[PDB]
Amino acid sequence: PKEPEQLRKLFIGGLSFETTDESLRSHFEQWGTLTDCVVMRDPNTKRSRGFGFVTYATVEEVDAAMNARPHKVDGRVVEPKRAVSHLTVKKIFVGGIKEDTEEHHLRDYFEQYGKIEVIEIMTDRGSGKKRGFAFVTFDDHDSVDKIVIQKYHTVNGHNCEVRKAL
Numbered sequence: 001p002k003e004p005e006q007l008r009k010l011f012i013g014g015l016s017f018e019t020t021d022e023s024l025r026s027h028f029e030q031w032g033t034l035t036d037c038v039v040m041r042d043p044n045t046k047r048s049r050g051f052g053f054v055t056y057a058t059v060e061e062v063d064a065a066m067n068a069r070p071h072k073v074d075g076r077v078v079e080p081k082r083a084v085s086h087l088t089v090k091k092i093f094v095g096g097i098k099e100d101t102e103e104h105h106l107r108d109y110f111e112q113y114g115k116i117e118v119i120e121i122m123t124d125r126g127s128g129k130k131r132g133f134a135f136v137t138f139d140d141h142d143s144v145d146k147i148v149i150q151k152y153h154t155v156n157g158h159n160c161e162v163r164k165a166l
């Protein structure tokens, strides 16, 4: 069974107006099989709108393309992002971790999604007791985008609620 097409798409902003369906495809085919590749254009003038999208055959190919950023396409650094499920943030809320979850539990799990810059385990302002939630800040938004599309996150035995923060 194929992964849903929405999860295989990359929206590419910041295109050179000279980028075409063919040149966008030639570039992004370096990281996987493209089932679709389109530059958005004005319906009357045919002038590029400066963005487009590519669809890979698999999610692992999307990952490969994102891991190969920055992408310079036809002389311009472009801005690839996964399809919306865009609220482009580098921080997540992690809820449901209870009182026994520590920094290393969160680091060991989340470091496989991206490079972590900050882990903040929330504690009660009055007592110092753990409140059962945390924030994790990454160096890049794609980590967050991969995280929030998963149905489940299991950390320290807890089934966690994870959402984009701020």
Ligand SMILES: CC(=O)Nc1cccc(NC(N)=O)c1
Pocket (backbone or CB within 6 Å): 088, 089, 090, 139, 140, 141, 142
């Ligand atoms: C690669 C990536 O996610 N960059 C990004 C995303 C959101 C905000 C900012 N802002 C900033 N000053 O760093 C940067």
